[PDB]
Amino acid sequence: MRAVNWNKKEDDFSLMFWKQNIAQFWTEEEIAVSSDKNTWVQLSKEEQIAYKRVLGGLTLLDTKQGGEGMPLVLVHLENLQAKSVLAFMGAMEEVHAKSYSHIFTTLATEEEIDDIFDWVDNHPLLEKKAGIITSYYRRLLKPEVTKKELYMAMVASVFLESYLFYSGFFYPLYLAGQGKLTASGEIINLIIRDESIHGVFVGILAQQIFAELSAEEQQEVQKETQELLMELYEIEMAYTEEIYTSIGLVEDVNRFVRYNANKGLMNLGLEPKFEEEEINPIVLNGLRTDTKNHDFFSVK
Numbered sequence: 001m002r003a004v005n006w007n008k009k010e011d012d013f014s015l016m017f018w019k020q021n022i023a024q025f026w027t028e029e030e031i032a033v034s035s036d037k038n039t040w041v042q043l044s045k046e047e048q049i050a051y052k053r054v055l056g057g058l059t060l061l062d063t064k065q066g067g068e069g070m071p072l073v074l075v076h077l078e079n080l081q082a083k084s085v086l087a088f089m090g091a092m093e094e095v096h097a098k099s100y101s102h103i104f105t106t107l108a109t110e111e112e113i114d115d116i117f118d119w120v121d122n123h124p125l126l127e128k129k130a131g132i133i134t135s136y137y138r139r140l141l142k143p144e145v146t147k148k149e150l151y152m153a154m155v156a157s158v159f160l161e162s163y164l165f166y167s168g169f170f171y172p173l174y175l176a177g178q179g180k181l182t183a184s185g186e187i188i189n190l191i192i193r194d195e196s197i198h199g200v201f202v203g204i205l206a207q208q209i210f211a212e213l214s215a216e217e218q219q220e221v222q223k224e225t226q227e228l229l230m231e232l233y234e235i236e237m238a239y240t241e242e243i244y245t246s247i248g249l250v251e252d253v254n255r256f257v258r259y260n261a262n263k264g265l266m267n268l269g270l271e272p273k274f275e276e277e278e279i280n281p282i283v284l285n286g287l288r289t290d291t292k293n294h295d296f297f298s299v300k
């Protein structure tokens with residue numbers, strides 16, 4: 001049947017995204033994380049635990065996005081060029097998942113790693129948020145899907161990649177911005193840089209499909225989008241509360257969540273939901289300065 005033909009455009013953006021995606025490729029081997037021990041051992045129990053929790057949580061999300069979300073969305077696309085980009089995004093999800101193990105391996109012992117994975121696995125909130133997302137992917141497990149079903153699986157993917165990670169990314173950024181666990185912060189920054197072009201791109205794909213829904217499908221899809229947002233917001237607020245009260249950050253993580261929920265919506269070409277809140281200046285600093293870009297030996 002059809003072979004991908006990159007010499008003839010299937011759309012106006014897949015090639016630019018393909019090139020951006022591959023230009024960003026990295027792998028954990030390029031970031032030694034061992035000198036982070038020095039700041040790791042200065043943190044308290046409650047801070048350690050919290051950092052382990054949010055990383056286990058991020059791992060679950062990359063586990064799902066790379067093992068079901070991208071495979072199940074891409075396989076029903078007719079655009080072979082967009083298909084190639086999603087396939088590559090899925091592999092990077094797995095590079096991301098595994099970098100968390102890379103970090104774990106310098107921070108915690110086996111037994112400690114075991115408990116994180118056990119806690120992640122048996123965690124009811126993670127099952128609920130991840131299940132909500134996943135049910136949209138598992139709906140595509142059949143030979144033919146509706147446009148509505150494909151749109152919605154893409155709504156769910158941009159919610160996961162632009163929004164649901166960020167209750168977790170908050171912590172390592174927060175510490176990096178203060179000089180703590182900065183090699184890991186670098187890894188977390190590369191993950192964000194991929195995640196955020198992942199979100200833009202599926203957002204674009206979602207918007208083309210939207211433009212082809214019947215006027216009233218468009219309504220059902222709007223309505224369902226909003227309820228999905230708020231049902232995840234509700235579970236993110238409980239998640240926040242249970243992760244971040246013991247170290248006093250809840251309301252700071254919350255503002256960061258709504259901030260990202262907004263970029264999520266915007267990626268879908270939708271109006272923002274929350275009023276413009278400023279982001280914690282110490283997370284701003286982790287994002288801006290704890291990057292692999294900044295990390296090199298000056299020749300001066």
Ligand SMILES: [Fe+2]
Nearest residue numbers: 062093096195
């Ligand atoms: Fe990721």
